[PDB]
Amino acid sequence: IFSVDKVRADFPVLSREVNGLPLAYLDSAASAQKPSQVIDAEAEFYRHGYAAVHRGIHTLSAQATEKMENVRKRASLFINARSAEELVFVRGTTEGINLVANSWGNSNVRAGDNIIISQMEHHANIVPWQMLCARVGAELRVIPLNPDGTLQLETLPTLFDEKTRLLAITHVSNVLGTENPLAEMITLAHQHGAKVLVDGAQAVMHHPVDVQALDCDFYVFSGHKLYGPTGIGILYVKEALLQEMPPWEGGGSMIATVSLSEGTTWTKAPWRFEAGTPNTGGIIGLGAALEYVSALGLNNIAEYEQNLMHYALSQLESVPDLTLYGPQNRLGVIAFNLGKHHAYDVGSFLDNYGIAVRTGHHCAMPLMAYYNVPAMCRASLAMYNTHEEVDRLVTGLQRIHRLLG
Amino acid sequence: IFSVDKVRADFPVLSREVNGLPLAYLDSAASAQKPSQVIDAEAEFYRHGYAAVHRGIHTLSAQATEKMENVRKRASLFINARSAEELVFVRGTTEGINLVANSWGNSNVRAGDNIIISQMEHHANIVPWQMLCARVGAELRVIPLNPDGTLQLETLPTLFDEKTRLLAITHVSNVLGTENPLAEMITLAHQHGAKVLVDGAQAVMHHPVDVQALDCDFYVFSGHKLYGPTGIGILYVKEALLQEMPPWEGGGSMIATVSLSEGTTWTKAPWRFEAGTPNTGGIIGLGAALEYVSALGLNNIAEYEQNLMHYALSQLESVPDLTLYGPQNRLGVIAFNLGKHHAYDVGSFLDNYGIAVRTGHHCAMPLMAYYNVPAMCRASLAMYNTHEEVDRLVTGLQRIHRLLG
Ligand SMILES: *Cc1c(COP(=O)(O)O)cnc(C)c1O
Ligand SMILES: *Cc1c(COP(=O)(O)O)cnc(C)c1O
Ligand SMILES: [Cl-]
Ligand SMILES: [Cl-]
């Protein structure tokens, strides 16, 4: 069972002060703080084992190469992929979606075809598809929202047809905390021969994820939201698909042969998709982040976070004129607005109290437009956040309401 | 003036042992070791100031955003760019070339046009242009090599014509150590209305670089070869060009507005070219690497390295049957083969002595083919390497020759 006090002891940032006040970091959905175990694993790699990794012969380079492929295997086990070779190292969720949109999209989505997204998607899972649709002359269809922040699943018959090549869908909304019924939707998409990319950037830190059970064709997430370093993420692709995909970025390490007269040939996947020096330091840190999370246990994390979320929603009932957005069973984040006050001002006052929340459109402008607001506040309730921090948020909103009403 | 002993004290890896023997790291051209100042600057950011950066309102996020834009300014001063807004953060040299090849290349290189590269280019500065040429139906022309590892500049009249859209050229060869006469070549390229991308990945650590004096249109380099963290590099583009370039990767932070009915608009450059969460940790580390190098002084580094290189070349004369590749005035690297022995075996014996060199084709297969060898050994002589390490290399090659002859 989970002890939030022992977990918080691993996170040096949580002792920091802001504005002279103790920090309450409620913005993990934008990016997560990192434990000492992750920070030090990367630092120690730099301090004692650093070298280039492309299977160099000397010892440090050979050992660094092995460390990197071991992290690839560990990540594949973390999401229950069948093979380490189904995982590609990318900069983050965003780059992984762009890689799919170009390598797979350009070869599989043709003029007159359509791609389906939802109205709750992050811009990372919208813009690459808008670009692809403009490149090839395809149509971008949209699953709309219900008022409670769930998908209008009844619209799926009008959106899926025989020209639907891809569903790109969020696992968990970064704003609403809605968890979408992926297994269901993937079954339906596969009935039409459509592939499914899942944006898992807000899923992998909250509960176990199993891509064989999901049967998704692509799955993406970012290391820095998973208590890991910036600059690294994971793209999972089914082996049979990944083996047919052409390269995206070109350069060293993704080639088999390079000739200026007879052209160039590519190596095998996933290495075909990793051009140039990888982010070895980020990969080491990501491996340590996975070990740290697995040691705590994702079901223990999920239990503690669900109880924290239930407590926050119960306490926020005592805030006057508070508008919440999204379903009651939300994961990870609480999106809200306070009376008629602009989110920017609410977030400013909260920051003035030492409380870090995110304000704005949260890279989800279509979602904001659906709710007819320009912005929202959002509080993340992660595994190192406490009841007392929730109390500080509730009290802060009460004070703000009273001061500005 | 330069003190190699004080510099080496900053680098914790240099005390490491390999095979039970003290490490001689002569592979900095593949990737450089990092000083404590760089390692700790990144670690301390994670420990005390970490947050997401897209101009979030709360304090940590606002301060992190400022740290990132300050590094952008520091990098622009480091290469004497006119404006911080001419620099784009990329994963490394390779990604930066791919970004140019797609964003600029797709809009400016048409069927029947030509692009000029050289026979000494790294694969990073070949493959993206091969891909572009195949995409748009253009021709990839090649400046050939002289036996001494310099460009056959006499061939330039037959290669430049009015259809030449781009010269992509290495500043310093990662194999030969040749420094190309960029200012000259850029003048000639501009006479034809061609743009010039410079691959500076092996230049920026050896002497000052000044892109206004060079007048190059694009310039790329990687942080990890500049004593900095992996996963981060710099693409410089002339403002007037960069402002016309369309985005490459799509997603959060590079947009102005996103609509599912009225389409999407882009923000201003360079931010238009940075999609999703940046590698904030790598950027912090890169800033510290720039400060560290500037504190030592690039002219002091260049002086010490030039004298070390002169010493090594003088000492290597006492190795029987040693073949050197490249010009006498080489920078940074010594490429060699020992008698008829395969580079792989020579490098294995050297690693067995604790000496890390690189063997293989060094991501320069066309260069290897020019010299009619499959592979070379390469020893890097960087600012923290010593005369004694050169002595160990010379003695090792002598022992290898005697044992295997
Ligand atoms: C290493 C190198 C590259 C590639 O840099 P990455 O950091 O691997 O992207 C490109 N060009 C030259 C000359 C190099 O030495
Ligand atoms: C943050 C996020 C992304 C983007 O991740 P990056 O790490 O910035 O690339 C994509 N999707 C969702 C749902 C997110 O929360
Ligand atoms: Cl290669
Ligand atoms: Cl955005």
CSV table of N, CA and C in Angstrom, one decimal, chain A residues 156-274:
chain,number,residue,atom,x,y,z
A,156,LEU,N,-20.7,7.6,-34.1
A,156,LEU,CA,-19.7,6.8,-34.8
A,156,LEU,C,-20.2,6.2,-36.1
A,157,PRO,N,-21.5,5.8,-36.3
A,157,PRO,CA,-21.9,5.2,-37.6
A,157,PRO,C,-21.8,6.2,-38.7
A,158,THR,N,-22.1,7.5,-38.4
A,158,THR,CA,-22.0,8.5,-39.5
A,158,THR,C,-20.6,8.9,-39.9
A,159,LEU,N,-19.6,8.5,-39.0
A,159,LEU,CA,-18.2,8.9,-39.2
A,159,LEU,C,-17.4,7.8,-39.8
A,160,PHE,N,-17.6,6.6,-39.4
A,160,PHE,CA,-16.8,5.5,-40.0
A,160,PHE,C,-17.5,5.0,-41.3
A,161,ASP,N,-16.7,4.9,-42.3
A,161,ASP,CA,-17.1,4.3,-43.5
A,161,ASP,C,-15.9,3.5,-44.1
A,162,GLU,N,-16.0,3.0,-45.3
A,162,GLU,CA,-15.0,2.2,-45.9
A,162,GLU,C,-13.8,3.0,-46.3
A,163,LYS,N,-13.9,4.3,-46.4
A,163,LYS,CA,-12.8,5.2,-46.7
A,163,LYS,C,-12.1,5.7,-45.4
A,164,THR,N,-12.5,5.3,-44.2
A,164,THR,CA,-11.9,5.7,-43.0
A,164,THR,C,-10.6,4.9,-42.8
A,165,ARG,N,-9.4,5.6,-42.8
A,165,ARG,CA,-8.1,4.9,-42.7
A,165,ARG,C,-7.6,4.9,-41.3
A,166,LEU,N,-8.0,5.8,-40.5
A,166,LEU,CA,-7.3,5.9,-39.2
A,166,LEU,C,-8.3,6.6,-38.2
A,167,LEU,N,-8.3,6.1,-37.0
A,167,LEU,CA,-8.9,6.8,-35.8
A,167,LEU,C,-7.7,7.2,-34.9
A,168,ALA,N,-7.6,8.4,-34.6
A,168,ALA,CA,-6.6,8.9,-33.7
A,168,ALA,C,-7.3,9.5,-32.5
A,169,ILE,N,-7.0,9.0,-31.3
A,169,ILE,CA,-8.0,9.2,-30.2
A,169,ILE,C,-7.2,9.2,-28.9
A,170,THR,N,-7.6,10.1,-28.0
A,170,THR,CA,-6.9,10.2,-26.7
A,170,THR,C,-7.4,9.1,-25.8
A,171,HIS,N,-6.4,8.6,-25.1
A,171,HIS,CA,-6.7,7.6,-24.0
A,171,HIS,C,-7.4,8.3,-22.8
A,172,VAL,N,-6.7,9.4,-22.3
A,172,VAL,CA,-7.3,10.2,-21.2
A,172,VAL,C,-7.1,11.7,-21.7
A,173,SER,N,-8.2,12.5,-21.5
A,173,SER,CA,-8.1,13.9,-21.9
A,173,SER,C,-7.2,14.6,-20.9
A,174,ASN,N,-6.4,15.5,-21.4
A,174,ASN,CA,-5.5,16.3,-20.6
A,174,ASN,C,-6.2,17.4,-19.9
A,175,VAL,N,-7.5,17.7,-20.2
A,175,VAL,CA,-8.3,18.7,-19.6
A,175,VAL,C,-9.4,18.2,-18.8
A,176,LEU,N,-10.2,17.3,-19.4
A,176,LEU,CA,-11.4,16.8,-18.7
A,176,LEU,C,-11.1,15.6,-17.8
A,177,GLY,N,-10.0,14.9,-18.0
A,177,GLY,CA,-9.7,13.7,-17.3
A,177,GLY,C,-10.6,12.5,-17.7
A,178,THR,N,-11.4,12.7,-18.8
A,178,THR,CA,-12.2,11.6,-19.3
A,178,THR,C,-11.3,10.4,-19.8
A,179,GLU,N,-11.6,9.2,-19.5
A,179,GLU,CA,-11.0,8.1,-20.1
A,179,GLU,C,-11.9,7.5,-21.1
A,180,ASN,N,-11.4,7.4,-22.4
A,180,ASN,CA,-12.2,6.9,-23.4
A,180,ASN,C,-12.3,5.4,-23.5
A,181,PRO,N,-13.4,4.9,-24.0
A,181,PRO,CA,-13.5,3.4,-24.1
A,181,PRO,C,-12.7,2.8,-25.3
A,182,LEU,N,-11.4,2.8,-25.2
A,182,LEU,CA,-10.5,2.5,-26.3
A,182,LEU,C,-10.8,1.1,-26.9
A,183,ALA,N,-10.9,0.1,-26.1
A,183,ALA,CA,-11.0,-1.3,-26.6
A,183,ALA,C,-12.2,-1.4,-27.5
A,184,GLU,N,-13.3,-0.9,-27.1
A,184,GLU,CA,-14.6,-0.8,-27.9
A,184,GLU,C,-14.3,-0.1,-29.2
A,185,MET,N,-13.8,1.1,-29.2
A,185,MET,CA,-13.7,1.9,-30.4
A,185,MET,C,-12.7,1.3,-31.3
A,186,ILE,N,-11.7,0.6,-30.8
A,186,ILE,CA,-10.7,-0.1,-31.6
A,186,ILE,C,-11.3,-1.3,-32.4
A,187,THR,N,-12.1,-2.0,-31.6
A,187,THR,CA,-12.8,-3.1,-32.3
A,187,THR,C,-13.6,-2.6,-33.5
A,188,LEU,N,-14.4,-1.5,-33.3
A,188,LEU,CA,-15.2,-0.9,-34.3
A,188,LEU,C,-14.3,-0.4,-35.5
A,189,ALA,N,-13.2,0.3,-35.2
A,189,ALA,CA,-12.4,0.8,-36.2
A,189,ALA,C,-11.8,-0.3,-37.0
A,190,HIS,N,-11.3,-1.4,-36.3
A,190,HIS,CA,-10.7,-2.5,-37.1
A,190,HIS,C,-11.8,-3.2,-38.0
A,191,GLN,N,-13.0,-3.2,-37.6
A,191,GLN,CA,-14.1,-3.8,-38.5
A,191,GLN,C,-14.1,-3.1,-39.9
A,192,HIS,N,-13.7,-1.8,-39.9
A,192,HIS,CA,-13.6,-1.1,-41.2
A,192,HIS,C,-12.2,-1.1,-41.8
A,193,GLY,N,-11.3,-1.9,-41.3
A,193,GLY,CA,-10.0,-1.8,-41.8
A,193,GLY,C,-9.2,-0.6,-41.5
A,194,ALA,N,-9.7,0.2,-40.5
A,194,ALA,CA,-9.0,1.4,-40.0
A,194,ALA,C,-8.0,1.0,-39.0
A,195,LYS,N,-6.9,1.8,-39.0
A,195,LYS,CA,-5.9,1.7,-37.9
A,195,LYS,C,-6.3,2.7,-36.8
A,196,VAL,N,-5.7,2.4,-35.6
A,196,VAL,CA,-6.0,3.3,-34.4
A,196,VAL,C,-4.7,3.7,-33.8
A,197,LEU,N,-4.4,5.0,-33.8
A,197,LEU,CA,-3.4,5.6,-32.9
A,197,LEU,C,-4.0,6.1,-31.6
A,198,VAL,N,-3.4,5.7,-30.5
A,198,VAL,CA,-3.9,6.2,-29.2
A,198,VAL,C,-2.9,7.2,-28.7
A,199,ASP,N,-3.4,8.3,-28.2
A,199,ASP,CA,-2.6,9.3,-27.5
A,199,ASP,C,-2.7,9.0,-26.1
A,200,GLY,N,-1.6,8.3,-25.5
A,200,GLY,CA,-1.6,7.9,-24.1
A,200,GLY,C,-0.9,8.8,-23.2
A,201,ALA,N,-0.7,10.1,-23.6
A,201,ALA,CA,0.2,10.9,-22.8
A,201,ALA,C,-0.3,11.2,-21.4
A,202,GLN,N,-1.6,11.1,-21.1
A,202,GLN,CA,-2.2,11.3,-19.8
A,202,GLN,C,-2.7,10.0,-19.2
A,203,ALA,N,-2.4,8.8,-19.8
A,203,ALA,CA,-2.8,7.6,-19.3
A,203,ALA,C,-1.7,6.8,-18.5
A,204,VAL,N,-0.5,6.8,-19.0
A,204,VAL,CA,0.5,5.9,-18.6
A,204,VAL,C,1.0,6.1,-17.1
A,205,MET,N,0.7,7.3,-16.6
A,205,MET,CA,1.1,7.5,-15.2
A,205,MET,C,0.0,7.2,-14.2
A,206,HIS,N,-1.2,6.9,-14.6
A,206,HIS,CA,-2.3,6.7,-13.7
A,206,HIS,C,-2.8,5.3,-13.5
A,207,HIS,N,-2.5,4.4,-14.4
A,207,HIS,CA,-2.9,3.0,-14.2
A,207,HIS,C,-2.1,2.1,-15.2
A,208,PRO,N,-2.1,0.8,-15.1
A,208,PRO,CA,-1.4,0.0,-16.1
A,208,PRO,C,-2.0,0.2,-17.4
A,209,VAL,N,-1.1,0.1,-18.4
A,209,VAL,CA,-1.5,0.2,-19.8
A,209,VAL,C,-1.0,-1.1,-20.5
A,210,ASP,N,-1.8,-1.7,-21.4
A,210,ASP,CA,-1.5,-3.0,-22.0
A,210,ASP,C,-1.9,-2.9,-23.4
A,211,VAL,N,-1.0,-2.7,-24.3
A,211,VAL,CA,-1.3,-2.4,-25.7
A,211,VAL,C,-1.7,-3.7,-26.5
A,212,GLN,N,-1.4,-4.9,-26.0
A,212,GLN,CA,-1.9,-6.1,-26.6
A,212,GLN,C,-3.4,-6.3,-26.3
A,213,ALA,N,-3.8,-6.0,-25.0
A,213,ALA,CA,-5.2,-6.0,-24.7
A,213,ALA,C,-6.0,-4.9,-25.4
A,214,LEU,N,-5.4,-3.7,-25.6
A,214,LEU,CA,-6.1,-2.6,-26.3
A,214,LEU,C,-6.2,-3.0,-27.8
A,215,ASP,N,-5.2,-3.7,-28.3
A,215,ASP,CA,-5.1,-3.9,-29.8
A,215,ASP,C,-4.9,-2.7,-30.6
A,216,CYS,N,-4.4,-1.6,-30.0
A,216,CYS,CA,-4.2,-0.4,-30.8
A,216,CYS,C,-3.0,-0.7,-31.7
A,217,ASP,N,-3.0,0.1,-32.8
A,217,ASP,CA,-2.0,-0.1,-33.8
A,217,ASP,C,-0.8,0.8,-33.6
A,218,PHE,N,-1.0,2.0,-33.0
A,218,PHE,CA,0.0,2.9,-32.5
A,218,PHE,C,-0.3,3.4,-31.1
A,219,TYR,N,0.7,3.7,-30.3
A,219,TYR,CA,0.5,4.2,-29.0
A,219,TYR,C,1.7,5.1,-28.7
A,220,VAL,N,1.4,6.3,-28.1
A,220,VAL,CA,2.4,7.3,-27.9
A,220,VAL,C,2.3,7.8,-26.5
A,221,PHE,N,3.5,8.1,-25.8
A,221,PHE,CA,3.4,8.9,-24.6
A,221,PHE,C,4.8,9.5,-24.4
A,222,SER,N,4.8,10.5,-23.4
A,222,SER,CA,6.0,11.3,-23.2
A,222,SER,C,6.7,11.0,-21.8
A,223,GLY,N,8.0,11.0,-21.8
A,223,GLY,CA,8.7,10.6,-20.5
A,223,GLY,C,8.5,11.7,-19.4
A,224,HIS,N,8.4,12.9,-19.8
A,224,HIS,CA,8.4,14.0,-18.7
A,224,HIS,C,7.1,14.1,-18.0
A,225,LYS,N,6.0,13.6,-18.5
A,225,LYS,CA,4.8,13.4,-17.7
A,225,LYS,C,4.8,12.2,-16.9
A,226,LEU,N,5.7,11.3,-17.1
A,226,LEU,CA,5.8,10.0,-16.4
A,226,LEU,C,7.0,10.1,-15.4
A,227,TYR,N,7.1,11.3,-14.7
A,227,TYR,CA,8.2,11.5,-13.7
A,227,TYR,C,9.6,11.3,-14.3
A,228,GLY,N,9.7,11.5,-15.6
A,228,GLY,CA,11.0,11.3,-16.2
A,228,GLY,C,11.6,12.6,-16.8
A,229,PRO,N,12.7,12.5,-17.5
A,229,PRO,CA,13.4,13.7,-18.0
A,229,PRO,C,12.6,14.1,-19.3
A,230,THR,N,12.9,15.4,-19.6
A,230,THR,CA,12.3,15.9,-20.9
A,230,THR,C,13.1,15.3,-22.0
A,231,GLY,N,12.6,15.6,-23.2
A,231,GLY,CA,13.3,15.2,-24.5
A,231,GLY,C,13.2,13.8,-24.8
A,232,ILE,N,12.3,13.0,-24.2
A,232,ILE,CA,12.2,11.6,-24.6
A,232,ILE,C,10.8,11.1,-24.5
A,233,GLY,N,10.4,10.2,-25.4
A,233,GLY,CA,9.1,9.6,-25.3
A,233,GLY,C,9.1,8.3,-26.1
A,234,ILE,N,8.0,7.7,-26.2
A,234,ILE,CA,7.9,6.3,-26.8
A,234,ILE,C,6.8,6.3,-27.8
A,235,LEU,N,7.1,5.8,-29.0
A,235,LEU,CA,6.1,5.4,-30.0
A,235,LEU,C,6.1,3.9,-30.1
A,236,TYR,N,5.0,3.3,-29.8
A,236,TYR,CA,4.7,1.9,-30.0
A,236,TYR,C,4.0,1.7,-31.3
A,237,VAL,N,4.4,0.8,-32.1
A,237,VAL,CA,3.7,0.4,-33.4
A,237,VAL,C,3.7,-1.1,-33.5
A,238,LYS,N,2.6,-1.7,-33.9
A,238,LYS,CA,2.5,-3.1,-34.2
A,238,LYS,C,3.6,-3.5,-35.2
A,239,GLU,N,4.4,-4.6,-34.8
A,239,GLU,CA,5.5,-5.0,-35.7
A,239,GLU,C,5.1,-5.1,-37.2
A,240,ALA,N,4.0,-5.7,-37.5
A,240,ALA,CA,3.7,-5.9,-38.9
A,240,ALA,C,3.5,-4.6,-39.6
A,241,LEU,N,2.9,-3.6,-38.9
A,241,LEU,CA,2.8,-2.3,-39.5
A,241,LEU,C,4.2,-1.6,-39.6
A,242,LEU,N,4.9,-1.6,-38.4
A,242,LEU,CA,6.2,-0.9,-38.3
A,242,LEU,C,7.2,-1.4,-39.4
A,243,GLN,N,7.2,-2.7,-39.6
A,243,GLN,CA,8.1,-3.2,-40.6
A,243,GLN,C,7.8,-2.7,-42.0
A,244,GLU,N,6.6,-2.3,-42.3
A,244,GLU,CA,6.3,-1.8,-43.7
A,244,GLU,C,6.5,-0.3,-43.8
A,245,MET,N,6.8,0.4,-42.7
A,245,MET,CA,6.7,1.9,-42.7
A,245,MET,C,8.1,2.4,-43.3
A,246,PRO,N,8.1,3.4,-44.2
A,246,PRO,CA,9.3,4.0,-44.7
A,246,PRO,C,9.9,4.9,-43.6
A,247,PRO,N,11.2,5.2,-43.7
A,247,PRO,CA,11.8,6.1,-42.7
A,247,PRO,C,11.2,7.5,-42.8
A,248,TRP,N,11.3,8.3,-41.7
A,248,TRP,CA,10.9,9.7,-41.7
A,248,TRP,C,12.1,10.5,-41.7
A,249,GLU,N,12.8,10.7,-40.6
A,249,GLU,CA,14.1,11.4,-40.6
A,249,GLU,C,15.2,10.6,-41.2
A,250,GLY,N,16.1,11.2,-42.0
A,250,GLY,CA,17.2,10.5,-42.6
A,250,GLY,C,18.5,10.9,-41.9
A,251,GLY,N,19.4,9.9,-41.9
A,251,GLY,CA,20.8,10.3,-41.5
A,251,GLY,C,21.5,9.1,-41.0
A,252,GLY,N,22.5,9.3,-40.1
A,252,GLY,CA,23.3,8.2,-39.6
A,252,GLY,C,22.4,7.3,-38.8
A,253,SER,N,22.9,6.0,-38.7
A,253,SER,CA,22.4,5.0,-37.8
A,253,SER,C,21.0,4.4,-38.3
A,254,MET,N,20.3,5.1,-39.2
A,254,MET,CA,19.1,4.5,-39.7
A,254,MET,C,19.3,3.9,-41.1
A,255,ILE,N,20.5,3.9,-41.6
A,255,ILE,CA,20.8,3.4,-42.9
A,255,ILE,C,21.4,2.0,-42.8
A,256,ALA,N,21.4,1.3,-43.9
A,256,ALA,CA,22.2,0.1,-44.1
A,256,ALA,C,23.4,0.4,-44.9
A,257,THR,N,23.2,1.0,-46.1
A,257,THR,CA,24.3,1.5,-46.9
A,257,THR,C,23.9,2.8,-47.5
A,258,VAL,N,25.0,3.7,-47.7
A,258,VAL,CA,24.8,5.0,-48.3
A,258,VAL,C,25.7,5.0,-49.5
A,259,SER,N,25.2,5.3,-50.7
A,259,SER,CA,26.0,5.5,-51.8
A,259,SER,C,25.6,6.8,-52.6
A,260,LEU,N,26.5,7.6,-53.1
A,260,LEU,CA,26.2,8.7,-53.9
A,260,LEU,C,25.9,8.4,-55.3
A,261,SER,N,26.1,7.2,-55.8
A,261,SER,CA,25.8,6.8,-57.1
A,261,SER,C,24.7,5.7,-57.2
A,262,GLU,N,24.6,4.8,-56.2
A,262,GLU,CA,23.6,3.8,-56.2
A,262,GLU,C,22.5,4.0,-55.1
A,263,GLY,N,22.4,5.2,-54.6
A,263,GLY,CA,21.4,5.4,-53.6
A,263,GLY,C,21.7,4.8,-52.2
A,264,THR,N,20.6,4.8,-51.4
A,264,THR,CA,20.8,4.5,-49.9
A,264,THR,C,19.8,3.4,-49.6
A,265,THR,N,20.1,2.5,-48.7
A,265,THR,CA,19.2,1.5,-48.2
A,265,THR,C,19.1,1.7,-46.7
A,266,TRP,N,17.9,1.2,-46.1
A,266,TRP,CA,17.6,1.5,-44.7
A,266,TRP,C,17.8,0.2,-43.9
A,267,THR,N,18.0,0.5,-42.6
A,267,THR,CA,18.2,-0.7,-41.7
A,267,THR,C,16.8,-1.1,-41.3
A,268,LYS,N,16.7,-2.1,-40.3
A,268,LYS,CA,15.5,-2.6,-39.8
A,268,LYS,C,14.8,-1.7,-38.8
A,269,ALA,N,13.5,-1.9,-38.6
A,269,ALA,CA,12.9,-1.1,-37.6
A,269,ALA,C,13.1,-1.8,-36.2
A,270,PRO,N,13.1,-1.0,-35.1
A,270,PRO,CA,12.8,0.4,-35.0
A,270,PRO,C,13.9,1.3,-35.4
A,271,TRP,N,15.1,0.8,-35.6
A,271,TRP,CA,16.3,1.6,-35.7
A,271,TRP,C,16.2,2.5,-37.0
A,272,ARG,N,15.4,2.0,-38.0
A,272,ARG,CA,15.2,2.8,-39.2
A,272,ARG,C,14.6,4.2,-38.9
A,273,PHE,N,13.9,4.3,-37.7
A,273,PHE,CA,13.2,5.5,-37.3
A,273,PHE,C,13.9,6.4,-36.4
A,274,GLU,N,15.2,6.1,-36.1
A,274,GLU,CA,16.0,6.8,-35.1
A,274,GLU,C,17.2,7.3,-35.8
